[PDB]
Amino acid sequence: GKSYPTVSADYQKAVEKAKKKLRGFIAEKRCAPLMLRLAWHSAGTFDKGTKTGGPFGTIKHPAELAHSANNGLDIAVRLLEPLKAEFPILSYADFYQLAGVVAVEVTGGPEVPFHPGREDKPEPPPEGRLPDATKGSDHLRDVFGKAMGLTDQDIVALSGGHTIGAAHKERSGFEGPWTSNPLIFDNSYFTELLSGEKEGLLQLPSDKALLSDPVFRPLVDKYAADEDAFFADYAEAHQKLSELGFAD
Numbered sequence: 001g002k003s004y005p006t007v008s009a010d011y012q013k014a015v016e017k018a019k020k021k022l023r024g025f026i027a028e029k030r031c032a033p034l035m036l037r038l039a040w041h042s043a044g045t046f047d048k049g050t051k052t053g054g055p056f057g058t059i060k061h062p063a064e065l066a067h068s069a070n071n072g073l074d075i076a077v078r079l080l081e082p083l084k085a086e087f088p089i090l091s092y093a094d095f096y097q098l099a100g101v102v103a104v105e106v107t108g109g110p111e112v113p114f115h116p117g118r119e120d121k122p123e124p125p126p127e128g129r130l131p132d133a134t135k136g137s138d139h140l141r142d143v144f145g146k147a148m149g150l151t152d153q154d155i156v157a158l159s160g161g162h163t164i165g166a167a168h169k170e171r172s173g174f175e176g177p178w179t180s181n182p183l184i185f186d187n188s189y190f191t192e193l194l195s196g197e198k199e200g201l202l203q204l205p206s207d208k209a210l211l212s213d214p215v216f217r218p219l220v221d222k223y224a225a226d227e228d229a230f231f232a233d234y235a236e237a238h239q240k241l242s243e244l245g246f247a248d
């Protein structure tokens with residue numbers, strides 16, 4: 001159950017103006033995938049049992065940026081700082097999650113509902129909570145299930161965020177896009193994953209894990225066949241992720 005906090009009218013006005021400015025900025029800079037990854041890596045540190053981590057603005061801290069999993073996200077933070085400065089009333093936590101919602105929207109994805117009121121927290125979570133691309137389904141459930149508190153459906157739908165963007169050998173070490181159209185939010189991640197490896201496209205071991213797991217594979221098949229079902233389940237999961245630890 002979520003009970004969202006009240007924010008002032010002025011705060012609500014700034015969310016709306018920031019949403020529009022983020023559309024223009026993220027479209028022009030071609031940085032939707034990185035902005036989605038910043039929001040995801042922000043939220044994905046939540047541990048439900050201790051209620052630590054999650055989307056509370058800490059990823060901008062040099063000490064969280066310096067986590068190995070977060071290679072390259074300093075770029076994201078830097079790119080957003082001038083625009084954030086235009087919206088002093090907004091928390092960083094809300095601004096980065098709004099950026100992730102807008103990243104999905106401006107690449108043609110679902111409209112993920114957005115609620116303001118996240119407070120910036122003073123201290124980043126311990127390093128080590130983000131998923132490891134070399135591991136498989138048990139590990140995915142450890143991180144998205146046992147720590148974050150998301151469902152198996154959420155795991156597969158959120159994995160579809162790889163439909164935009166690419167890996168970089170100087171960041172993670174992996175290299176290349178998952179899809180032929182890495183600035184378009186669609187179900188291609190799943191149709192690629194099914195079709196086997198393609199010259200010039202990437203699959204992580206963690207993506208492949210989806211194919212061999214009895215619960216994940218029917219969802220991959222669903223999303224490959226029905227982009228609308230993918231969009232519905234993605235929007236549900238992204239909203240949940242963006243709200244972990246918030247408004248509970």
Ligand code: HEM
Pocket residue numbers: 033034036037040072131132133134140158159160161162164165166167168169171172173174204206
């Ligand atoms: C399931 C487990 C996860 C693993 C192991 C994983 C791993 C990775 C890796 C290794 C990269 C490449 C980083 C680089 O070299 O630039 C990456 C990027 C990406 N990830 Fe994930 N990922 C996972 C889940 C997610 C989720 C939950 C989403 C958000 C819904 C997400 C969104 C993205 C985006 C959009 C990119 C591309 C970034 C860019 O183009 O710079 N990933 N991920």
Ligand SMILES: [K+]
Pocket residue numbers: 163164179180181182183184185186188189
């Ligand atoms: K795509």
